[PDB]
Curated annotation (Swiss-Prot):
GO biological process annotation, one example: proteolysis
Catalytic activity line of the entry: Hydrolysis of proteins with specificity similar to that of pepsin A, prefers hydrophobic residues at P1 and P1', but does not cleave 14-Ala-|-Leu-15 in the B chain of insulin or Z-Glu-Tyr. Clots milk
Gene Ontology molecular functions: aspartic-type endopeptidase activity
E.C. code: 3.4.23.22
Disulfide-bonded cysteines: C255-C290
Species assigned in the record: Cryphonectria parasitica (Chestnut blight fungus)
Peptidase A1 domain: residues covered: 17-328
Keywords annotated in UniProt: Aspartyl protease, Disulfide bond, Hydrolase, Protease, Signal, Zymogen
Annotated protein name in UniProt: Endothiapepsin
Length: 330
């Protein structure tokens, strides 16, 4: 089997991407944030505290003939941005892009934090990291990808995120029309439950490439590129008037600037992030200070190749017995 679904930016900045997902029978279509940095499929639901729902589409298990309570199971998750959600669990049929999983754990939110309530466009998350990070207790549950894997033509999914445009998530096949050149594969450590890999270095603009190992995760659920403070300082030093603002919470730059590209290494290959991808626009409406798309990881404890980086590539998440991660230009 295979599946193919279009993923759409939620706003003009590409702050996140939503992908329609069919849950239940008859289908209830929710727009989920596919997140390769977490491992829970959770949704706004008929159980979510009413004051915490503001325009999201909800899953109502009582209207699904295939829903079953997963008795006694609860979940609770906290993300890197400080957001959180928790609730109970149903099993149900879940389809993405024509690919169907029966018996998928669908984590129904009873509570969500303010950042989720305030985002009307995101009806929940679909985690695509390793199932060892799933938060269901007392019986940990599998991701949609882990449940689909054995049925897929190839045990892979691919992320092809757009810059200010729709893109695609495919499951079970590699669309050889979707990228240029060849795919460079690189080793993955699953020790922390993430798609963790080591970049071979970076360049700023037309500058020389610096060979240096940068361990980090491929995380579709993170907007920005978070890298070591040395690398980030080297990038923003090339932008007149850029500075790190403790008041804003990261590097800002004049909105009049033209940003340089940023290149990262994948083995001997190179992925170039155009400068325009690094502009996240005014810090507040009408400001002439703009927020940078490359930020320090120093306060995180991990480097994160988020959407800024991933949308410059065609990315293969290879879930074979020995997982690997492939990158191609596009």
């Amino acid at each position: 089997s295979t599946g193919s679904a279009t993923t759409t930016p939620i706003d003009s900045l590409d702050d996140a991407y939503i992908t329609p997902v069919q849950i239940g029978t008859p289908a209830q279509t929710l727009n989920l944030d596919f997140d390769t940095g977490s491992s829970d499929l959770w949704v706004f639901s008929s159980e979510t505290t009413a004051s915490e729902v503001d325009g999201q589409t909800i899953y109502t298990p009582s209207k699904s003939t295939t829903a079953k309570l997963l008795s006694g199971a609860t979940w609770s998750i906290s993300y890197g941005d400080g957001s959180s959600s928790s609730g109970d669990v149903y099993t149900d049929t879940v389809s993405v892009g024509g690919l169907t999983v029966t018996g998928q754990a669908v984590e129904s939110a009873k509570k969500v934090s303010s950042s989720f309530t305030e985002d009307s466009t995101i009806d929940g998350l679909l985690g695509l990291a390793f199932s060892t990070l799933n938060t269901v207790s007392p019986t940990q549950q599998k991701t949609f990808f882990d449940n689909a894997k054995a049925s897929l033509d190839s045990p892979v999914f691919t992320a092809d995120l757009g810059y200010h445009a729709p893109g695609t998530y495919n499951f079970g096949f590699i669309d050889t029309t979707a990228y240029t050149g060849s795919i460079t594969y690189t080793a993955v450590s699953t020790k922390q439950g993430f798609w963790e890999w080591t970049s071979t270095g970076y360049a700023v603009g037309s500058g020389t490439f610096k060979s240096t190992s940068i361990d980090g995760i491929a995380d579709t659920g993170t907007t920005l590129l978070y890298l070591p403070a040395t690398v980030v300082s080297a990038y923003w030093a090339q932008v007149s008037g850029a500075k790190s603002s403790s008041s804003v919470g990261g590097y800002v730059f004049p909105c009049s600037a033209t940003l340089p590209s940023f290149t990262f290494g994948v083995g001997s290959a190179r992925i170039v992030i155009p400068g325009d991808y690094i502009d996240f626009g005014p810090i507040s409406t009408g400001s002439s200070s703009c927020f940078g798309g490359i930020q320090s990881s120093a306060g995180i404890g991990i480097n994160i190749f988020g959407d800024v980086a991933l949308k410059a590539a065609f990315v293969v998440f290879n879930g074979a017995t020995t997982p690997t991660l492939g990158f191609a230009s596009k």
